Swiss-Prot record, chain A:
Sumoylated; SUMO2 modified in response to stress caused by inhibition of proteasome activity (in vitro). It is found in: Nucleus; Chromosome. The modification N6-acetyllysine is found at residue 12. ATP 2 binds at residues 33, 78-79, 172. This is DNA replication licensing factor MCM4. Early fractionation of eukaryotic MCM proteins yielded a variety of dimeric, trimeric and tetrameric complexes with unclear biological significance. Specifically a MCM467 subcomplex is shown to have in vitro helicase activity which is inhibited by the MCM2 subunit. The MCM2-7 hexamer is the proposed physiological active complex.
Curated annotation (Swiss-Prot), chain B:
This is DNA replication licensing factor MCM7. The lineage of its organism: Eukaryota, Metazoa, Chordata, Craniata, Vertebrata. Residues 14-187 form the MCM domain. The chain holds residues 319 to 719 of 719 of the full protein. A motif (Arginine finger) lies at residues 162-165. GO terms for cellular component: chromatin; chromosome, telomeric region; CMG complex; MCM complex; membrane; nucleoplasm; nucleus. Residues 226-357 are annotated as: Interaction with ATRIP. It comes from Homo sapiens (Human). Residues 170-213 are annotated as: Interaction with RAD17. It is found in: Nucleus; Chromosome.
């Protein structure tokens, strides 16, 4: 509709390149250095999953959109990355650490105003300083994270709202320094529910390695265009046109991955997140079927995040 | 300016005269005067590869009450072309666009306004807020306690202090001779209606304003030759700040600040290319700011170089290598005997091989 035949042909030619994914990783945030896995995760979130209606099953609409949590020291690439995502993504929202009731002056009737979360429906919402937020708001966040809906019962007003948004959150450890400990709560002090709801958690640690400081300083003092402009329309085309579906081989691979993962501890929600990541990678390759490569890459990324 | 007035500015030691010309009524604190002069000049603004960098210099001066911070702020408010002088409670950022916002009693303000100050510091925007922030602060207890940490004594977040490119501590340390000199200077200022007679009479306010306006007009370009030296110096400073736990977090902001200082110095000296002297002066200023908070041995080394996996060394090779280094054979023999006394090695009676014990 919005693309001519030559644009589709160019997109197919680019997709036929096996390196495009990594190249697209190089395309995202050129000013940010040595965060390739983070760029890969951001791209996968941009692709997201596929929407499925389970009305015949009697089950609620399962979440099909990816959320990523970032934690580290302030002054790092958090704010710049959040601004980059907000600027690049249409309908993006930027917030710092909901619906409300307004009196109509004409009919004296209480009408509803939609907060930024509702306004960013089908878009991406990014939040800075997650740790420093009030507990009431974080209690509200559980429903939008899980069911993608939001119910209000206040002053006789009872309503339900759709909140199809992706949360990209940045947080600061409580010590303001990575104290050598074991669990992420020991450094960040977050409840298990919120952590379990996140699909991907990444930690930004400034290593005490001299060569890394050399590279950072050189990148700063020395501080592509063909990619992001095409990529916006490419992502729109992928969202509108293709949807992957699961296969038997990927079924067996995911079952084995789950049974192996639980030995480390594991919840079915991480299995759902792995399915979503496989769908995202299949969309990345513009493949209508989910194969072994998607599952293997998703498991690799998850295990890399867990190891770090 | 009239170019003759620029020459009247360009005598010998003109940098020192310009530094002293700012608030000469307050004795000492030449480093703070240089910092304020560089704030008046300011760095360069660039927008490379889609990101905007700041050239504005924001300085935080903290000290015990009575160190003449308010008078310095009033003087810099008077001298700056666009200047907005404000207090903690009494508030301005937009009004001082392309100017200097001098704010005092920073430590005596609620955190809600402080939160909005961070965006202004980081992006110079609110609307645009492209202004140089000059903040004044006092210790929580009225006296600076070196035992307590800097953040506790300032009761401000570490990020806010990091966003300030320069921090200057002034302590009222009691010294008898310094106290007498300060007292006599105050007496002379009070009686004679004037500053005490220094080596050179300070320049007029209008002349300094015009000079700053002209120096702001130039945009020096950083040569690529000094980049390696700048990286080495930044590495040394960051290593030092990592070894010391009480030092401020030397992130990218420190490198940006020193680059801004070098560009401001280049603008001050009216040169389109930044030289190594500007970099050295910036390093000196940053270091001062952070401080406010025998032939026998040579011949032994020469023959040690020939111990690459061998216990015995030929006499002729060692002699030739020592002579090639600029030592006469007599000194070689003397060093050999002196290190032979120390039971280090034994020389063959034929003087052909030496066995290292």
């Amino acid at each position: 509709k919005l693309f001519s035949e030559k644009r589709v042909e160019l997109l197919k030619e680019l997709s036929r390149k096996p390196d495009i994914y990594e190249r697209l990783a190089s395309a995202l945030a050129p000013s940010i250095y040595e965060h390739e896995d983070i760029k890969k995760g951001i791209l996968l979130q941009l692709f997201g999953g596929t929407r499925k209606d389970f009305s015949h099953t009697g089950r609620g609409k399962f979440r099909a959109e990816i959320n990523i949590l970032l934690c580290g020291d302030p002054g790092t690439s958090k704010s710049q990355l959040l601004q980059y995502v907000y600027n690049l993504v249409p309908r993006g929202q930027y917030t710092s650490g909901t619906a409300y009731v307004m009196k109509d002056p004409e009919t004296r009737q209480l009408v509803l105003q939609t907060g930024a979360l509702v306004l960013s429906d089908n878009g991406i919402c990014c939040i800075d300083e997650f740790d420093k937020m009030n507990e009431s708001t974080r209690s509200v966040l559980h429903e939008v994270m899980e069911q993608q809906t939001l119910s209000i019962a206040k002053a006789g007003i009872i309503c339900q709202l759709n909140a199809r948004t992706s949360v990209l959150a940045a947080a600061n450890p409580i010590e303001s320094q990575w104290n050598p400990k074991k669990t992420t709560i020991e450094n960040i002090q977050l409840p298990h529910t919120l952590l379990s709801r996140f699909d991907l958690i990444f930690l930004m640690l400034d290593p005490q390695d001299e060569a890394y400081d050399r590279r950072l300083a050189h990148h700063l003092v020395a501080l592509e265009l063909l990619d992001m402009a095409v990529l916006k329309d490419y992502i729109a085309y992928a969202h509108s046109t293709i949807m992957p579906r699961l296969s038997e081989e990927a079924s067996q691979a995911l079952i084995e991955a789950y049974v192996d993962m639980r030995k480390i501890g594991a919840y079915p929600r991480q299995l759902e997140s792995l399915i979503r990541l496989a769908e995202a990678h299949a969309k990345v390759r513009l493949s209508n079927k989910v194969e072994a490569i998607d599952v293997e890459e998703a498991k690799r990324l998850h295990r890399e995040a867990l190891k770090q | 300016l009239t170019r003759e007035e620029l020459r009247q500015i360009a005598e010998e030691d003109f940098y020192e005269k310009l530094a002293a010309s700012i608030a000469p009524e307050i004795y000492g604190h030449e480093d703070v005067k240089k910092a304020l002069l560089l704030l008046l000049v300011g760095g360069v603004d660039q927008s490379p590869r889609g990101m905007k960098i700041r050239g504005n210099i924001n300085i935080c001066l903290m000290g015990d009450p009575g160190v003449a911070k308010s008078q310095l702020l009033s003087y810099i408010d008077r001298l700056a072309p666009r200047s907005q002088y404000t207090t903690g409670r009494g508030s301005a950022l937009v009004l001082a666009d392309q100017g200097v916002c001098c704010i005092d009693e920073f430590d005596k303000m609620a955190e809600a306004d402080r939160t909005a100050i961070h965006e202004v510091m980081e992006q110079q925007t609110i609307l645009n807020a492209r202004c140089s922030i000059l903040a004044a602060a006092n210790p929580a207890y009225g006296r600076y306690n070196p035992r307590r940490s800097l953040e506790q004594n300032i009761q401000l977040p570490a990020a806010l202090l990091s966003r300030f490119d320069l921090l200057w501590l002034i302590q009222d340390r009691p010294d008898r001779d310094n106290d007498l000199r300060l007292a006599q200077h105050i007496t002379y200022v009070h009686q004679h209606s004037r500053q005490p007679p220094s080596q050179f009479e300070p320049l007029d306010m209008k002349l300094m304003r015009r000079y700053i306006a002209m120096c702001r007009e130039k945009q020096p370009m950083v040569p690529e030759s000094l980049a390696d030296y700048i990286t080495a110096a930044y590495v040394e400073m960051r290593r030092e700040a990592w070894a010391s736990k009480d030092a401020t977090y030397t992130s990218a902001r420190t490198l940006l600040a020193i680059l801004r200082l070098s560009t401001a110095l280049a603008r001050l000296r009216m040169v389109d290319v930044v030289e190594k002297e500007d970099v050295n002066e910036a390093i000196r200023l940053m270091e001062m700011s952070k401080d406010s908070l025998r032939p026998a041995d040579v011949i032994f080394a020469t023959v040690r170089e020939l111990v690459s996996g061998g216990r015995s060394v030929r006499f002729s090779e060692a002699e030739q290598r020592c002579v090639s280094r600029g030592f006469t054979p007599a000194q070689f023999q003397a060093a050999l005997d002196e290190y032979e006394e120390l039971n280090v090695w034994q020389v063959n009676a034929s003087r052909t091989r030496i066995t290292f014990v």
